[PDB]
């Protein structure tokens, strides 16, 4: 495996950080989170959602044809 100390070369970056006992674990959970999820949702709906409505449409049609075609059917046999 690989160990801290031998990963890669980094120069010039400062990282400032706080102790957990000094900060909140949920700061603006709703205030900032909700907006954030709305935003990630917008960013991906166009790629995720369409194939699924496409399946959805074929799902309802497909079963619809199945019922009307076979069972419900016995349409005309008139004499």
């Amino acid at each position: 495996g690989r160990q801290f100390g031998h990963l890669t070369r980094v120069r010039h970056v400062i990282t400032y950080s706080l102790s957990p006992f000094e900060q909140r674990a949920f700061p603006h959970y709703f205030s900032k989170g909700i907006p954030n999820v709305l935003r990630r949702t917008r960013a991906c709906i166009l790629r995720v959602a369409p194939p699924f409505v496409a399946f959805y449409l074929v799902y309802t049609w497909g079963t619809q044809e199945f019922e009307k075609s076979k069972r419900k059917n016995p349409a005309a046999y008139e004499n």
Binding site: V10, I14, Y16, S17, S19, E22
Partner: protein, 89 residues
């Protein structure tokens, strides 16, 4: 002006101590203090504001990553009590 104001604000008698050690005698030093130092707080301020507010200590980390340097320096500390506390011994 920033300097002169900082000076006036701070180089005021009651916050100064004239110290000496060696082959002297206290009276000579006292005499000299009176000769060359009398006339500093012949004023002394009305509402000035020379008070020191306590300083919040924060459990935190600052990492300045620089792989171009041959050795790492690291300094850890917890909050100490202060000059006055007997716990220091």
């Amino acid at each position: 002006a920033d300097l002169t104001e900082y000076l006036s604000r701070h180089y005021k008698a009651p916050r100064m101590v004239l110290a000496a050690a060696g082959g002297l005698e206290h009276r000579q030093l006292l005499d000299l203090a009176q000769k060359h130092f009398s006339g500093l707080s012949g004023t002394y301020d009305e509402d000035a504001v020379p008070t020191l507010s306590p300083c919040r200590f924060t459990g935190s980390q600052i990492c300045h990553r620089e792989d171009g340097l041959p050795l790492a320096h690291v300094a850890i500390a917890v909050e100490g009590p202060g000059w006055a506390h007997p716990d220091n011994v």
